[PDB]
Each structure stands twice: as structure tokens, then as C-alpha cells.
Design a protein around this ligand. Structure first.
Ligand SMILES: Cc1cc2c(cc1C)N(C(=O)c1ccccc1)c1c([nH]c(=O)[nH]c1=O)N2C[C@H](O)[C@H](O)[C@H](O)COP(=O)(O)O
Ligand SMILES: Cc1cc2c(cc1C)N(C(=O)c1ccccc1)c1c([nH]c(=O)[nH]c1=O)N2C[C@H](O)[C@H](O)[C@H](O)COP(=O)(O)O
Ligand SMILES: Cc1cc2c(cc1C)N(C(=O)c1ccccc1)c1c([nH]c(=O)[nH]c1=O)N2C[C@H](O)[C@H](O)[C@H](O)COP(=O)(O)O
Ligand SMILES: Cc1cc2c(cc1C)N(C(=O)c1ccccc1)c1c([nH]c(=O)[nH]c1=O)N2C[C@H](O)[C@H](O)[C@H](O)COP(=O)(O)O
Ligand SMILES: O=C(O)C(=O)c1ccccc1
Ligand SMILES: O=C(O)C(=O)c1ccccc1
Ligand SMILES: O=C(O)C(=O)c1ccccc1
Ligand SMILES: O=C(O)C(=O)c1ccccc1
Ligand SMILES: [Mg+2]
Ligand SMILES: [Mg+2]
Ligand SMILES: [Mg+2]
Ligand SMILES: [Mg+2]
Lengths: 333, 333, 333, 333
């Protein structure tokens, strides 16, 4: 594989169509899904030349750990849909690559099993029924050694995914929510989480500048600027289009991550140049999982690592910090 | 049906081609028809997160009545072209959905019969021959219980609809103007209407900011910012592109509606975020009518209601007022 | 015929391919040819409503004559290429429509014969060899009753027309320059013309704002803002994109015409809304000529007249002056 | 041949596919390769009229020599890939056309042989292993009569060229680096070069404004604003999009060249209008070489010379200096 796009083709060959559609699709007319890619394609980087590149490093420190790349695996529910080893295959590959893995509330293997893989994992929270049960999930994750709580805040309910409706898609009986034997989150819920853990709380799905500022005020340690990969509000602005404004508004008060459409090391470089601390990558990780299980995900991460290093150095950046200081220009495509 | 586009395909199957073209077409090169869609596709919403959604309501108060959605059925002449029950099928479905229905001057069932369906209907006026006859139509509508007069002001004469000319289209002898056994409107005509009724007068087809301001000065209770679905001046700006400027200029002095290209609840949300009080929907209502008569229109309204609620809540809006306070960003497509 | 595009198809059927290409083509990669159309398609008009339209008139006064439309036939050399009656067929149709016809220096019928048709014609000048011979052409045109001298100033030499080169195109021996049995123009040449005639001198092919101002300073009675239909510099800006700036800079000091890509009455309305006094139309006139000779051109002019009236009134303009006061908005297509 | 595009088709016919791909391709998704063309296509020139064109000249003085056109042949490694005479065929044609030829560090014929052709050549440097060996290449080039050192500064290492990876491309054993029997450059390397030669040092691959200013401060005699033909960082801004800003920032302190996508004399004119001293042309020279060897390159240069003269005069420019004073307008395509 020489690009992330090689893996999509390979996943399409192997997966049943309805599963590939669950993975690929967006809500509504898929306008936000397409705009995630359009928005990245319009961004051009202004590289710097003639800088010392004797020890180019792609590492970052985030949420108290060193990561090998400015990248984490995004929360994607029900990974046994894509391969029988599901979340364990992905978490092992992430660990070995030095990349954070986000364990999902709707994981198809229990959070404790995935955390046992090692690799200092993060945990993604959906707000439950009950303040008490939500807080018990958080405490489970913390007791298992998760290092951050990624509170997904863009899902008061699930978006209308027309491919899934047309397909009549539903979970095979062999895939379950392994953390179990939901209610809309508010700012009060965020406070309840923050008060119940010493881990950093990261709010995922922020797009409005004032919501970014309020996240800082609320004691978040990070946010993920995101339209949920075009799967929630159809017509929501891409996160990459809000990122620069959000980074300026928080003015270093929390880590600012982005996701949606990241498909190469060049894309990671664009996100960092716009001010991102790191990115999340969703669909490509699942394509690699579907195509070749753990070794697929390892090869994907390897490929991304090489593309990130290549892009950084071509742009004159010996560190991710330097990449954040790059300027950009909007083009037409 | 899971999108409004399912119904277009179904209407194309059933209708004779020349009738489908009368419905679908625009004037000239159809540049304004296409731009109505392009303009909406370029608008992205910036959703808000973590707000209380315990009683999300899509209701609005407009022209003295509660409506179930920020939406009304647009005036479309000669609805028996599309189904034998024509206007009665549509008005019944609108009533049952709690959506205003606009009865047309060129309705193929008499205004009194349609008003008898109930549902507190509006009446669309074309200026006649004669100040006296125009005012008699208005008085008929008012006597029948219509609640607003939608004065169409963008038709000094009909636009050049090339599909209809190429087809040699004409009304089947079984479709007539049931209100009967036209001259260009001016501001004087508006005053004559305003002086002759206590109902709100809504001027439909306003695009210039100064015409919006003058509409307020003239005592209009509303305007519909509109290029007549691309059927009048070919090259007229889409209403959605003028809406924000117009809303700022009237500064609450009348209700500001918009139409042209509204094809989903997401589109309704975009219109409200740009400052619209409500939208009109034209062609999609007729597709549903053609496809399945009254029950078709009911299903369409049901679908739109669900899409509006879904979009609002995903955007953090518990009310239409809150949706009006959303910000937007123009993208490229 | 219900659009100008019907006539192009009809001309393509009848003309030999190499002649159709001489007519259709542009220079270089035809980037300026395409941009003439793109530029018009991006312009949207903001129509006005509810104005008195009791005597809508499309007439203008220009260069001391009433014209029936804000339009003239552009100078197109060698019109016998397209029909055996050539320039006489076109000039007769123009006369009967009340539209100015521009007689070309490279006309395939002598200027005196064409002027004898009547209709108060204009004369287009190319600068010759010789100040003396150039001035003799001007005096011929004036003696024959031409009413303006359209000095083409964008042809120091002919552009590189790759269709013609690829075709090995050349004039059939039956088509000649009937005014005869060239050197680049300068501002000195303009002065020599201005000093030798009392007719208005109109400089055709101006695109720079400072050249428009200098044209006024030089005593021009008009300019034609033009990239020569994309046939001269490939990559020259479309005239329609310079028009508004030029109109503001001359501030009523001369008539400001535009050409390139005008294909409907809606396009004429856009040009006037951007500040044009009138337009020239080139290729469409030749399509009508090729398709049906004099009666073809009559039908074209009839069609354009109806489209101009239709567009004006739909836009709330009772006169061309009012159309010049319309505002516009740039869109995306 | 009547356009540069005729030669691409001819090169595609003759070259083995993997060689054509080595020539045509870019890095990554080829976004920067495509953007080089898009960026030029968006630029329109505002031509001037009625200026004296009695002795239009396309000549410039650069780096102490007269050149016949504001153009040089770009450094392209391994030209024996394309024709058996390789660099000698191209250098001879360049000499005869009065165009500078850039001899490459990775030339497939030795720099001394190519310099012996005559035509006052330039030499392109890649930084070696060793300050000492790099400086020996420079001294060789100077001893052989090269007139400028084009220090390529955008290649700390080679970009990821996916066509080449997919093809498993490698140099045929009959093509070698004839200057031999690499380490990343820094500003210190530039200083080492500047101190070791009296020739002008030209830094090729600058895109950031501050790097342009620093190049002047460092004693460069020129820069080439360039993204390396889309072959280095994928997502690097096109040079043509940075050019105007860079020209203003250096304010005459060094020559400012540009490359990437120049495919006609019209494109050369656009580059000059944006402030370029001259352009480099890469791929088209190799297409002509592949198609017809030395005589191919001669015909290409002949064609470009005619297109440059044609464009200049159509734009009212008697000299390249005048072309630099032309204004431009960005369009949509
Ligand atoms: C491709 C995909 C993405 C999700 C799920 C399932 C699938 C198949 N997720 C879910 O299906 C899920 C989402 C909401 C409610 C219930 C299940 C999921 C989720 N987010 C999140 O915080 N919890 C979930 O568990 N997402 C979004 C994901 O984290 C991410 O924002 C993006 O994928 C980014 O863009 P990409 O790199 O272009 O793919
Ligand atoms: C699709 C359609 C739209 C009309 C008619 C017929 C048809 C088949 N109408 C007419 O045909 C009509 C219009 C002018 C003169 C005589 C008949 C009509 C009209 N308006 C209005 O105020 N009285 C009429 O009665 N319109 C415009 C309509 O109210 C509306 O502005 C839009 O349809 C909005 O865009 P959409 O949601 O994209 O379709
Ligand atoms: C389509 C066409 C246009 C010309 C000629 C021949 C043909 C076949 N003309 C010539 O062929 C001609 C031009 C330069 C030198 C010798 C012959 C011509 C000319 N101009 C002008 O002032 N004298 C000439 O005589 N033009 C340009 C014309 O006046 C006009 O600017 C446009 O056609 C406008 O755009 P359109 O409406 O999109 O077609
Ligand atoms: C088309 C092409 C372009 C290069 C090479 C090989 C080929 C086949 N060059 C190389 O292959 C090369 C580049 C880096 C490392 C080793 C070999 C090359 C180079 N630059 C440079 O300074 N030394 C090298 O020697 N370039 C870039 C070239 O100078 C130029 O910037 C552009 O080609 C401009 O755009 P274009 O007119 O659209 O083609
Ligand atoms: O009710 C839903 O839409 C749903 O399944 C869900 C899942 C996760 C979070 C919130 C809602
Ligand atoms: O005369 C017309 O164009 C016409 O039919 C009409 C219809 C309604 C309103 C105004 C004019
Ligand atoms: O020499 C030319 O290019 C030519 O034919 C011409 C024609 C008219 C005007 C100027 C030049
Ligand atoms: O190591 C490389 O990528 C390489 O081949 C190279 C070639 C020229 C300059 C610098 C690096
Ligand atoms: Mg992503
Ligand atoms: Mg609508
Ligand atoms: Mg024209
Ligand atoms: Mg180039």
C-alpha cells in the first residue's frame, strides 16, 4: 500500500455492501461528508526551506503522554463488524505504533479487555439514561487505565443515515455492545464528568467558536473540532473550516484536535498548519482493519507515519510545533 | 420515502412528460432554477452543542396562528394537473399536518371549496383587469376564512418557459381556473389591497433590499423573498442569497419568508439560520401529490417534519427562534 | 426558434466545418472565449417589483440616432462566408429591426452597397499601411452615410486561431475584401481619425481602465469594452468583468458598450445593469445568417427584442436607463 | 506543432509508459501538480491598447547576459531517459534559440560536455555529503563557463512519487549520473556557496515570503518561486500564487523567477504581469526532446518565442519591462 486509498479499495472488495455503507456513509445528502474532503483539498501549505532537519521528530506530548505522531485513532463503534478481532486488532496495532486508541462506549469488545492490550488508551463516552451509570462508565475506564475521557457531544441522538435506512442495516447478532448487559448531554453533564475524574476531559464534536471557549471555561482539557465525519447534522460546517478561528479563540487554554477526512500525512500537516494539536483518523483505520486485520492497521500507521515525516521535512519542520507555525493559502480546486 | 428526492423519481414515472416539465421547468436557460439549489448547497450551518433539548418544538406563530413547522405550501396553480383530487388532496394533508396551505388565484378547485377543508388556509392573489375585481377576490378569500393574502408581485406577466414552448404545452380541457367564469401590480395596488382587508398582506417575490423596506413602509405583514422558483426572470438572484441582507434591513418590521429549492429539513434549518421566519415549499409538494395523492402529501410533510426536528436538535436548537440565532459559513461545493 | 442556441445548432448543420470553426473559434486555448460566457453566467440581477410598466420601451438614443434595442450588430468580416447574400442580408434585417449594423473594413460586399440598404449603419475601421488610405476609408464611410466610426484597437495583428491553423483555413476564392482593389494603430492614429471626421469615434477593444479614461481624453464618443470575442489575446479578461469599473471611471464622458458572449435578452439586461449603454452581438447574428439568410437574422432580432422586453419588465424597468440602475450580485455556477 | 500540447501527445506515443510517468507525475495525490495549472488558468491579463509596437522585443538581461526570451530551460535530471542525445540535444537547441539551459547535478552527460556546447549555460546544484564535494561541483561548473548557480533548496530528500513506486521505476542501466564516479541544504550551505563563487547564486524552490527576503539578505542574485512542478510537497502552494507577494517583498533586491505549469507564451505573459523576471519550463522541453530530439526542442522554442511575441504585442507591450507593468484580474474557470 502506497496511499490510504489503496486500503479503501481493498476494504470494499472484502466487506459485505451494507457494512461498507455503514462505514462509508453520512447523514442526509452526505453534503458534510463530501465537504470534509473539499475543505482539505482547498488548503495549500506554504513550506519553509533550508532549516535544520537533522532530527526531525513527529512526536507530540498530549494529555500527559508522548505520542509517536500527532494522531489518534478515532472512536468508531462495533469494530467486529469489520474483522473478527475487532477492537483488539486495532488497539494492538495502535499500541505498537505509539498512537493513542480511543475505546468506544459502543465497543464490540469490553473496554477492560481493550485496555489490557496496553498502549495507554483513551475512552469515548456517550451520556446514558442516568448521571449514575454514565459516571460508572467513566470510573470503569479510569480504573482500567484509560488516560482521557473523550466525551462525544454532537449526538443528542443519531443522525439520519440514508444508506443504512435504504439497506435496512442492523447489527448482526454476533456483534454486541460489550460494555453493557442514552440521553442528550448538556453542559451540566460535562461538569458532572469533570467533577468525577482527574483525567482530562475532551469534548468531541465542537464547531462553534463560543462552544470552544465555553469548553475551556468548563475545564476541558481538549476539544475535537468535528462534524462527526459527516454523519450527524447534514450541512454542518467541516471542522477544518472552523479550526483556525477556534485555535485563536482558545489561545492555548486546551488542546485543539480536528477530524474529518484526514487521508494522508499531507492532510495531517495541513491540520497542524491550521493550528491543530493532533488529528483523529476514523474510516481509514477501519479500511485497514477490514482489509488485513491487525497487520493491515499496522501497515496503515506505518504509511501515515512515513507520510507525516516526509511532509514535515519537505515543509522545513523539525517538529510538530514548527508545523503549527506554517502558513497556508486557500486555493481553488 | 426517506428523502424528498424519492418522491421526484416517483412523480416522473407517473406524470405525462409535458406535465412533469411544466412542474420542473424554469424560464430561459434555467440559470435561476439551478442557482436556487447551488445557493443552498453553499451554505453550511455552525451547530451548537450541549443545550437543553428536553422539549424541542418546531412550531411557530405566524399571521396570528400556530403552525406545526416553519413551513407553508407554496402557491402552485392548477393542481388537478398532477392528481385528480388536486388542491383538495393537498389542503387536507396540510391541514392534518398543521401546515398552512396557500390557495391560488388560478386554483383548479374553487377557493371556497378548498377553504372548506379547514386548516386555516392563506390566499394568493394575482392582480386582475380591474381594481374592483381584484378586491372582490380578496373579499371572497376573507369571507371564506383565509388568514393572509399572499400578493404575488413578481409576475407583471408570465416568464418565458422554454420547456412549455417546446412542448406546445397547454391546459387539458379537464383543468380550468375554477375561481372564474390580468394586469401588472404596482405599489398602488398593494395599498388598495391593504385598505380593503384586515388580513395580513404578504408580498411574494421581493428580492431587492429597498423593496423589502418599502414593503414594510407600505404596511405589509410579511414578504416572501423569492425568484419564483426560477420561473420568472432568468438570471434573478436566488432569494436565499438576499435573505440575510433583507432580514437585517427590515429589522423585525414584518415576517420574512423565503422560497426556492427547499428540499429537506436541513434546508429549512439553513433558511432559518439566515433569518427566515418560515419557508415555502413548491415542487416537492406536487411530486408527492402526483405520486400518491393525499397520502403522498401526508408522507412528504411527515418526512419534512422529522427532518426539521432532527436538524434542529442536532444543531442545539430547542425552538425555531434559537435556530434563527445560528451562524452560517459559506463553503465551496 | 425560442433561444439563440437553436440557431447555433442550425448553423452547425449547414456550414462547412472549417467555416463553422472560423466563426466559433478563439485564439490559443480559447480560455478568453469560454470566460466570456462564464463571466455572464456568474452575474445575477436583483430585480425590482411593483413599478409602472404601462409603456415599457427598449429604445435608446445613441450617437445621435434612436435604436430599437440597446444592441448593435458587431463587425464580423467576410459575411459571404456564411450565406451568399452576406452583409446585405444582415444589414437589411438590422434596418428593419431598427438595430445599428456595423459595416466592416473587411466586408465581402462594398461599404457603399451596404450603406445603400439604409438603416443608418456604422463603419468599423482597421488602420491601414498609410495614414492617407485610412483616412480615405473613413471619408468613404462618412460620404456613404455611416453614422459612427468603430475603430478597432485590439488588432495590431491577428491572434493565433488554432482551429484555423489546424484546418488550413483560407478564404474561398469567391469571398474577397470588397472595399479594396495593415499597420498597428496608436493614439496618434486615433487623433488623426478624430481630426478628419465629425462622426463619433468609438474605440473597440478597450479593457484597461486607464485606456477608457484616455479614450475620453482623446475625444472618443464611445468605447466597446471587449476582448474581441476571445479571438485576440488568449487570457485577456472578459469585457463584462471590466465594465463596471470602466463605467465608473468615465463617469458619463462617453458611451460605454460591451461585447462578448451576449446570447439572450437576459444577458443584455445583465450588461445594462453593469452600466453598459448597449451591447454588440457577433456570432449569433452569423448563426442566424447561416441558418436562414435575411429572414434568419430577422427572426433572431425579433427573438432578442422579445427577450429584452421580457427581462426588463420582469426586472421592473420601463426604460433602459432604469435597467442601468439595477443592482447585481455575483454568484457561483 | 501549433501548441505545446501537440508535443505532449507525441511524447506519450513514443516513450515507454514508466518513463512518461516519471516525467509527468507528481508527489502524493498530485494536488500541487494540478494546482500549478489551475492557478495559471485563473489569471487573466488586462491588455493595453494603442501603444507603439514598432520594435517589440522579447529579450531580457539576466545574470549578466542577454537572453532571447524571459525563459530558461528548467533543471530536469537524466535527460537520456527521453532521447539518446539527452542533455546535448536540449543544450544545443537552447543555445541556438538564445535561451539559458540549466545543467543538472544529476545530468546523464557530464557538465563539462554540456557546457562545451556553448550558449552560456547555468548549473543546478544539489547539496552533497560534504561541504567540500559540493563546493567542488560548483568550482567545476564555474571552470566550465556556467554563468549562474541554481541551488535547489526544496529537496532535503525526494518526494513520494506514487506513479514511480507503483511502476517500480528505476534508471535503466544505460542512464547514469555522469557528473559522479546527498545531504539536506541549510542557510549555512547557501553562505558556503556564496563565499566560494563570484557567480550569481539563485535559490530554486522558495515559496514563503520570509524565505524570499532572507534569500536577498543572504546575497542571492535570484530566486525561483516554485513547488518543484508538484513533485516535492504534495499540497505546497503553486509558485504563481505566491509570486506577486514575493515580488513586492524583495522590492528589486534580486531577480524573481517562477516555474510550474508554464505551457504557452500567454502563460509567460501572465507570469511577467505578476512580476516575474523570467520563467523556467520543464516538462514541455522534455516532451519535445522525446518527440524529435534536438529539432523537437528547437521547434518548441520557436513556437514559444512566437507565442511570447504575439501575447506581448496583443497586450500592448514593446518590452518585457512593460509586460511586468500589466495588471491582472483573477477569474473563475
Ligand atoms: C466512520 C464511523 C465514525 C463514527 C462511528 C462509526 C463509524 C463507522 N461511531 C458510531 O457509529 C456511533 C456514533 C454515534 C452513536 C452511536 C454509534 C462513533 C463516532 N464518534 C464517536 O464519538 N463515537 C462513536 O461510536 N464516529 C465518528 C468518528 O469518531 C470520527 O469523528 C470521524 O470518523 C472522522 O472522520 P473520518 O476520519 O473521515 O472517518
Ligand atoms: C412549480 C410551480 C410554481 C409556481 C406555479 C406553478 C408551478 C408548477 N405557479 C404558477 O404556475 C403561475 C405562476 C404565474 C402566473 C400564472 C400561474 C404560481 C407560483 N407562485 C405564485 O405566486 N402563484 C402561482 O400560481 N409558482 C411559484 C411557487 O409559489 C414558488 O415560488 C416556488 O415554487 C418555489 O420554489 P420550489 O420549492 O423550488 O418549487
Ligand atoms: C466571430 C467573429 C468576430 C470578429 C470577426 C469575425 C468573426 C467570425 N472579425 C474578423 O474576423 C477580423 C478580425 C481582425 C482582423 C481581421 C478580421 C472582426 C471582429 N471585430 C472587428 O472589429 N472587426 C472584424 O473584422 N470580430 C469581433 C466581433 O466584432 C466581436 O467583438 C465579438 O464577435 C463578440 O463576441 P460574440 O458576440 O460572442 O461573437
Ligand atoms: C519534470 C521533472 C522536473 C524536475 C526533475 C525531473 C523531472 C522529470 N528533476 C529531478 O528529477 C530530480 C529532482 C530532485 C532530486 C533528484 C532528481 C529536477 C527538478 N528540479 C531540480 O532543481 N533538479 C532536478 O534534478 N525538477 C523540477 C524542474 O526543475 C521544475 O521545477 C518544473 O519541472 C517545473 O514545472 P513544469 O514546467 O511544469 O515541468
Ligand atoms: O437514540 C439514538 O439515536 C442512539 O442510538 C444513540 C446512540 C448513542 C448516543 C446517543 C444516542
Ligand atoms: O399574461 C400572462 O402572462 C398571464 O397569464 C398572467 C397570469 C397571472 C398573472 C399575470 C399574468
Ligand atoms: O496582419 C494581420 O495579422 C492581419 O491580417 C490584420 C488584419 C486586420 C487588421 C490588422 C492586421
Ligand atoms: O535521498 C534522496 O531522496 C535523493 O535521492 C536526493 C536526490 C537529490 C537531492 C537530495 C536527495
Ligand atoms: Mg479524519
Ligand atoms: Mg422552496
Ligand atoms: Mg456579444
Ligand atoms: Mg513551468
Amino acid at each position: 500500500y502506497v496511499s490510504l486509498a489503496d486500503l479503501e479499495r481493498a476494504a470494499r472488495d472484502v466487506l459485505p455492501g451494507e457494512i461498507f455503507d455503514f462505514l462509508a456513509g453520512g447523514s442526509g445528502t452526505e453534503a458534510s461528508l463530501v465537504a470534509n474532503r473539499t475543505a482539505l483539498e482547498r488548503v495549500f501549505v506554504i513550506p519553509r526551506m533550508l532549516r535544520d532537519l537533522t532530527d526531525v521528530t513527529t512526536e507530540i506530548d498530549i494529555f500527559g503522554r508522548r505520542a509517536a505522531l500527532p494522531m489518534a485513532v478515532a472512536p468508531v463503534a462495533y469494530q467486529r463488524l469489520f474483522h473478527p478481532e475487532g477492537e483488539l486488532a486495532v488497539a494492538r496495532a495502535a499500541r505498537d505504533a505509539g498512537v493513542p486508541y480511543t475505546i468506544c462506549t459502543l465497543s464490540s469488545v469490553s473496554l477492560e479487555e481493550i485496555a489490557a492490550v496496553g498502549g495507554r488508551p483513551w475512552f469515548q463516552l456517550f451520556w446514558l439514561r442516568d448521571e449514575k451509570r454514565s459516571l460508572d462508565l467513566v470510573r470503569r475506564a479510569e480504573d482500567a487505565g484509560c488516560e482521557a475521557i473523550v466525551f462525544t457531544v454532537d449526538v443528542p441522538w443519531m443522525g439520519r443515515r440514508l444508506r443504512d435506512m435504504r439497506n435496512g442495516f442492523a447489527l448482526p447478532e454476533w456483534v454486541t455492545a460489550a460494555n453493557f448487559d442514552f440521553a442528550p448531554a448538556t453542559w451540566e453533564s460535562v461538569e458532572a464528568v469533570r467533577a468525577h475524574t482527574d483525567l482530562p476531559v475532551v469534548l468531541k464534536g465542537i464547531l462553534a467558536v463560543e462552544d470552544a471557549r465555553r469548553a475551556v471555561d468548563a475545564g476541558a482539557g481538549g476539544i475535537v473540532v468535528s462534524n462527526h465525519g459527516g454523519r450527524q447534522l447534514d450541512g454542518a460546517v467541516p471542522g477544518i473550516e472552523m479550526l483556525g478561528e477556534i485555535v485563536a479563540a482558545v489561545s492555548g487554554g486546551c488542546e485543539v484536535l480536528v477530524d474529518g477526512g484526514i487521508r494522508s500525512g499531507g492532510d495531517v500537516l495541513k491540520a497542524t498548519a491550521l493550528g491543530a494539536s493532533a488529528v483523529l483518523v476514523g474510516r481509514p483505520v477501519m479500511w485497514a482493519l477490514a482489509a488485513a486485520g491487525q497487520d493491515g492497521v499496522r501497515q496503515l500507521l506505518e504509511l501515515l507515519a512515513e507520510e507525516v515525516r516526509d511532509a514535515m521535512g519537505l515543509a522545513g519542520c523539525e517538529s510538530v510545533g514548527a508545523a503549527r507555525r506554517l502558513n497556508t493559502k486557500l486555493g481553488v480546486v
